[PDB]
Design a protein around this nucleic acid. Structure first.
Ligand code: MG
Ligand code: MG
Length: 678
DNA sequence: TGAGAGTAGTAGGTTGT
DNA sequence: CAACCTACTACCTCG
């Protein structure tokens, strides 16, 4: 085509074709007593399956097995929703399954994965955790070690053969007491675990007290409490460590050092990247080895044809290579702006170099700049808000806050406090110093995006002149479904919309349509017309007919559309057969899905290609991939590294994250071109 | 709070039928 | 139940 071909390996491997015994599994009818309700029937079968033993999986309103009935537990009980059901399994012969059919293919894949897990459990001496296995020591030191292995998957192809997915992975384990850990000049860890069970404890203050002299409620002492439960049989008790429950907040419980064990994270190791060549090596090694342990034959690595998409041409006022360059060359679109400085460290006026850099920039862009300084501290209560309102009145559009590093709660409180008065903010943290150029340049880009300037845009010719991303965020049992967009054939404007509260991940049909409509209306305000075609991007999978209503409404306005499910995980891995690993690789797969490797640099380790599904619409793939790839480059708030996600989705995820953090109630007075969440 | 991917560690929560 | 989203923490860099 227009774009240049090459060939790649996937981290997938073809094994045997399925013989007929594997194609004619035992079928079983499940009889529950009493009968289950409609929502509970489906998971209870899964429950009956584990209790059934052997190698059995859910099938329809019944069971499928690769084990003969004689070694299953056909009669039993299973307690679930506080009701004890008696199950009886009734065998109904074997029956042929057809591999071309995605439903039965789903069952054969389930049966295969169960087969795999059971075959791994009987391996020795290797360490099994579900579908991940760890084989050798990658590292080790005084009291700790890192195991290495792979995460595995097994399923069945549309042509009825086994398929192996392999991806190297690491495990960190410690198996050392807290006392001994400290007794070798390590510092105190973040997290710790009971030596006698799984309970974690957030560690805190090691303590000066004594046990066999500390008093627990019940007349007993720490020492004799733990002694009583006999835990001081193997171990010896320690100093007196203090722990706070992980759910509980800052309540302190006592605890011997001799009975705690540190839990280690990455933070605690002062590789695991694996430059891609090594990962590819290891993947082939582990794959072939697994093939050998299993009665599945010789593993053959899967190849796919790949194409390199043209490199997008990024623009400020003139040609650019990174968004930080717009600081020197000028923005795509400049407007008359005013910015404020808030010093929370007890310092005085504007840092000089910042003033020089921005002034130079707005000079290049040919727009006028006015700089203000806010004289008030938030500790002044309501007068602080008064000063904020006064500032907004004087024309101020965004705020820079120079402060020592803030605790999250205080950070959120301040940000929000400015937001209710329509002031997006950029925090920058003192010390700073001019020679730390990247940090303060990225903060500066953030500031400009938050006052609504468009620092960069594209130069290509793309199929859709409006692109919109959708995601749900927030962590309090409810979420925020939100949308963000890039407007114009040039992506010349960036906008967000107010999210909506929802029960979970599924965005209601009418909500989808309303957010979409707001972006259409925005396009109407800029271009003076409706878009010929829009590109609709959903983060993660698109749930059944979630877009149906929005889609129909679009068809009704005479607007053409494309729906793309963009999945951040599950897309596996891609390694070139002989060249360099390059950015911007398009890899078509089955009929409507394809991979897209958008971001990569060598000092990061092996990339994680995105997986994309064209759920609806009739624009050709290649062009979809082309536009999405180019859109990954639009993000204005990262000066030196493009995000993996295309600009609308990266914005959407950051939007719902921020609304999920602060609240939605502050946004009533904040303009939609101002990206307060970056 | 500079922010980016890719890592593993913890703790969450949700969709399917 | 089963498989798979979100959110946070280092780190080293700076298309
Ligand atoms: Mg997200
Ligand atoms: Mg930010």
């Amino acid at each position: 085509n227009h774009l240049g071909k090459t060939e790649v390996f996937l981290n997938r491997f073809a094994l045997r074709p399925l013989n007929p015994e594997e194609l004619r599994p035992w079928r079983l009818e499940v009889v529950l007593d009493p009968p289950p309700g409609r929502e509970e029937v489906y998971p209870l079968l899964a429950q009956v399956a584990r209790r059934a033993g052997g190698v059995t999986v859910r099938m329809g309103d019944g069971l499928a097995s690769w084990s003969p009935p004689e070694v299953l537990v056909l009669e039993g009980t299973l307690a679930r929703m506080g009701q004890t059901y008696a199950y009886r399994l009734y065998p109904k012969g074997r029956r042929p399954l057809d591999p071309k059919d995605p439903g039965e293919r789903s069952v054969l894949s389930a049966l295969a994965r169960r087969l795999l897990q059971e075959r791994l459990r009987r391996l020795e001496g290797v360490w099994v955790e579900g579908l991940a296995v760890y084989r050798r020591e990658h590292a080790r030191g005084p009291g700790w070690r890192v195991l290495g292995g792979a995460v595995l998957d097994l399923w069945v192809s549309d042509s009825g053969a086994f398929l192996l997915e392999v991806d190297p992975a690491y495990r960190i384990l410690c198996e050392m007491s807290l006392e001994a850990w400290l007794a070798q000049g390590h510092p105190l860890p973040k997290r710790v675990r009971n030596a006698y069970d799984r309970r974690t404890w957030e560690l805190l203050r090691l303590g000066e007290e004594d046990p066999k002299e500390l008093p627990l409620p019940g007349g007993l002492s720490l020492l004799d409490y733990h002694a009583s439960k006999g835990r001081l049989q193997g171990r010896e008790g320690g100093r007196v460590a203090w722990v706070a429950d992980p759910k509980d907040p800052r309540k302190p419980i006592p605890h011997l050092t001799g009975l705690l064990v540190p839990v280690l994270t990455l933070e605690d190791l002062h590789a695991l990247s694996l430059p891609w060549e090594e990962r590819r090596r290891r993947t082939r090694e582990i794959a072939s080895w697994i093939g050998r342990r299993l009665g599945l034959g010789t593993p053959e690595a899967v190849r796919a044809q790949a194409y390199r998409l043209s490199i997008p041409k990024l623009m400020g006022r003139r040609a650019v290579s990174k968004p930080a360059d717009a600081l020197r060359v000028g923005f795509y679109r400049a407007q008359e702006t005013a910015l404020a400085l808030l010093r929370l460290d007890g310092a005085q006026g504007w840092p000089e170099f910042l003033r020089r850099a921005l002034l130079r920039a707005f000079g290049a862009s040919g727009a006028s700049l006015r700089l203000h300084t806010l004289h008030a501290h938030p500790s002044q209560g309501l007068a602080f808000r008064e000063a904020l309102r006064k500032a907004k009145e004087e024309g101020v559009q965004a705020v820079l806050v120079l402060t020592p590093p803030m605790a999250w709660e205080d950070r959120n409180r301040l940000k929000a406090l400015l937001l209710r008065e329509g002031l997006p903010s950029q925090i920058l943290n003192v010390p700073l110093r001019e020679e730390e150029r990247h940090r303060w340049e990225n903060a500066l880009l953030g500031l400009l995006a938050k006052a609504g300037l468009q620092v960069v845009a594209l130069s290509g010719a793309y199929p859709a002149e409006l692109a919109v991303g959708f995601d749900a965020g927030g962590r309090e049992s409810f979420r925020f479904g939100g949308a963000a967009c890039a407007v114009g054939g040039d992506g010349g404007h960036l906008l967000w919309t107010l999210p909506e509260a929802q029960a979970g991940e599924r965005i209601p049909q009418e909500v989808v349509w309303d957010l979409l409509e707001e972006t259409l209306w925005a396009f109407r305000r800029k271009a003076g017309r409706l878009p010929s075609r829009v590109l609709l991007l959903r983060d993660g999978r698109v749930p059944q007919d979630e877009f149906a209503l929005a889609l129909e409404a679009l068809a009704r306005e005479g607007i053409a559309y494309d729906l793309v499910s963009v999945r951040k995980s599950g897309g596996g891995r891609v390694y070139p057969v002989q060249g360099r690993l390059a950015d911007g690789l398009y890899v078509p797969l089955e009929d409507k899905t394809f991979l897209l490797l958008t971001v990569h640099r060598d000092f990061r380790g092996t990339p994680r290609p995105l997986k994309l599904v064209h759920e609806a619409g009739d624009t050709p793939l290649e062009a979809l991939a082309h536009q999405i790839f180019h859109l990954t480059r639009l993000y204005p708030a990262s000066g030196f590294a493009f995000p993996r996600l295309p600009a609308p989705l990266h914005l959407a995820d950051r939007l719902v994250k921020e609304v999920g953090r602060l609240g939605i109630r502050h946004l009533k007075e904040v303009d939609r071109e101002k990206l307060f969440f970056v």
